[PDB]
Amino acid sequence: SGYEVHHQKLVFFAEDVGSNKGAIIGLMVGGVV
Amino acid sequence: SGYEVHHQKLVFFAEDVGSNKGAIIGLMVGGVV
Amino acid sequence: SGYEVHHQKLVFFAEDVGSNKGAIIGLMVGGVV
Amino acid sequence: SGYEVHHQKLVFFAEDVGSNKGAIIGLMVGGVV
Amino acid sequence: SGYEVHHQKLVFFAEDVGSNKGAIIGLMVGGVV
Amino acid sequence: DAEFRHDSGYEVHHQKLVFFAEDVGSNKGAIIGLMVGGVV
Amino acid sequence: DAEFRHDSGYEVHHQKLVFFAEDVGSNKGAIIGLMVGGVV
Amino acid sequence: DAEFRHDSGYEVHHQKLVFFAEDVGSNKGAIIGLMVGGVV
Amino acid sequence: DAEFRHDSGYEVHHQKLVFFAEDVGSNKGAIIGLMVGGVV
Amino acid sequence: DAEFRHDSGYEVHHQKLVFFAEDVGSNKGAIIGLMVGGVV
Amino acid sequence: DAEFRHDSGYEVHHQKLVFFAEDVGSNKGAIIGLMVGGVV
Amino acid sequence: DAEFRHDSGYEVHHQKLVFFAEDVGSNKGAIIGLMVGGVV
Amino acid sequence: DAEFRHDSGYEVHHQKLVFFAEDVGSNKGAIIGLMVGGVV
Amino acid sequence: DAEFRHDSGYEVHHQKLVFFAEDVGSNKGAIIGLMVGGVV
Amino acid sequence: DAEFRHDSGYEVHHQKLVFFAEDVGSNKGAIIGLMVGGVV
Amino acid sequence: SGYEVHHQKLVFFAEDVGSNKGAIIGLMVGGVV
Amino acid sequence: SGYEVHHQKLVFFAEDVGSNKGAIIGLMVGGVV
Amino acid sequence: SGYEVHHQKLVFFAEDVGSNKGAIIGLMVGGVV
Amino acid sequence: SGYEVHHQKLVFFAEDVGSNKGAIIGLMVGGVV
Amino acid sequence: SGYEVHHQKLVFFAEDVGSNKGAIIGLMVGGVV
């Protein structure tokens, strides 16, 4: 049905990625990968 | 049905990406990849 | 049905991307990739 | 049905990733990978 | 049915990952990998 | 006086291929009958 | 006086291919009968 | 006077392949009949 | 005067392959009939 | 004057393969009929 | 529909030859540095 | 549909030859540094 | 549909030869440094 | 559909040969440094 | 569908040969440093 | 020095000759080939 | 020094000759081949 | 020194010769092959 | 020194010869092969 | 020194010869092979 999301604070740095066959996520809320 | 999202603060830096066969995400809310 | 999204603040920097066969996203809300 | 998520604070740094055949996540809430 | 998650604070650093055939997660709440 | 070779090339030939595909969703990567070297 | 070679090229030939595709969604990458080297 | 070789190339040939696919969801990587070397 | 070789290449040939796939969910990696070397 | 070889390559051939797959969930890794060397 | 080949021909190349002859009597046949196929 | 080959030909190459001959009497046949196939 | 081959041909190459001959009487046949196949 | 081969051919290569001959009388047959197959 | 082979051919290579001959009388047959198969 | 030859009677027939690297002779008297 | 030859009678027939690396002779008197 | 040869009668027939690396002779008198 | 040869009568037939590395002779008188 | 040879009568037939590395002779008188 749905999402209620708030007041999230994120900082990030990503170094080299070869092959992302999937999920590289800071915060993942109910997603499908 | 739906999303209610707010007051999110994000800063990010991404280094080299080779092949992104997927999701590289700061915050992912209910998405499909 | 729908989205209600607000007061989001984002800053980002992306370095070289080879092949983006997917999603490179700061914030993704309910999208399909 | 759904998610109620809030006041989350995240900082992260990722070093080189070879092949992400899966999930590399700071916080994962109810997602499917 | 759903998730109620809040006031989480996370900091992390990831070194090189070869092949992530699975889950490398700081906090995982009810996800499926 | 010496011989130096890099023969890192390739050859493909006598092949018979039938490739049939039904509905495809996001094709994030590849569906390949036969792949000979290369990078997706 | 010496010979130097880089033969990193390619050859493809006697082939018979039938490729049939049904509905395709976003094709983010490739659907290839036969791929010989190269980069998608 | 010496011979030096790097023959890290490849050859593929007498093959008969039938590849049939039904509905595919996100193809994050690859579905390959035959893969000969290479990188997905 | 000496011979030096790196023959780290490859050959594939007399093959008969039938590959049939039913519904596929996220293909995070690969479904391969035959894989000969390479990296997914 | 000496001979030096690295033959860490490969050969695959007379094969007959039938590969059939039913519904696949997240394929985190691989389903392979035959894998000859390589890395998933 | 079929391929038919007779490749009974020839190739000769990177060669360095020094040929010196002193008095020759009846040369009934041949004095050859290098002979590649053929008939005397 | 079938492949038919007769490759009864030949190749000769990286060679260094020094051939020196002193007085020769009737040469009934041959004096050859190197003979590769053929008929005298 | 079948493959048929007669590869009864030949290859010769990295060679270094020094051939020196002193007085030769009737050469009824042959004096050969190296003979590779063939008929005298 | 079947493979048929006659590979009754030959290969010769990395060789270093020094051949020196003193007076030769009737050479009824052959004096050969190295003979690889063939008929005198 | 079956494989049939006659590989009755030959290979010769890394060799170092010094052949020196003094006076030869009728050479009815052969003087050979190295003989690999064949018929005199 | 010399030859004294007489009253010789010869009849001959020769079939195909491939390569005559030598002597094919009915009567040879003191010759050099 | 020499030859004294006489009253010789010869008839001959030769079939195919491949390679005559030598002497094929009816009568050979003191010759060199 | 020499030869004194006489009243010789010869008839011959030769079939196929492959390689004559030598002497095929009806009568050979003091020759060198 | 020499030869004195006479009143010789010869008839012969030769079948196929492969390689004559030597002497095939009806009558050989003092020859060298 | 020499030969005195006479009144010799010879008839012969030779079948296939493979490799004559030697002497095949009807009558051999003082020869060298």
Numbering used by the authors:
A (entry chain K), B (entry chain O), C (entry chain S), D (entry chain G), E (entry chain C), P (entry chain Q), ...: 8 to 40
F (entry chain P), G (entry chain T), H (entry chain L), I (entry chain H), J (entry chain D), K (entry chain R), ...: 1 to 40
Pull verbatim passages from the article behind this deposition:
Adult individuals with Down syndrome (DS) develop Alzheimer disease (AD). Here we report the structure of Aβ and tau filaments from two DS brains. Tau filaments (paired helical filaments and straight filaments) were identical to those in AD, supporting the notion of a common mechanism through which amyloids trigger aggregation of tau.
In the two inner protomers of type IIIb Aβ40 filaments, the density at the N-terminal region was resolved due to inter-protofilament interactions, allowing us to model residues Asp1 to Val40. The outermost protomers of type IIIb Aβ40 filaments are composed of five β-strands while the inner protomers are composed of four β-strands. This extra density, probably a charged host factor, interacts with both the disordered Asp1 and Lys16. Type IIIa Aβ40 filaments (~3.5 Å resolution) and type IIIb Aβ40 filaments (~3.8 Å resolution) represented ~15% of the Aβ filaments. We were unable to observe the three fibril structures reported by Kollmer et al. but rather determined two structures composed of Aβ40 filaments formed by Aβ peptides ending at position Val40, types IIIa and IIIb Aβ40 filaments, which were reconstructed at 3.5 and 3.8 Å resolution, respectively.
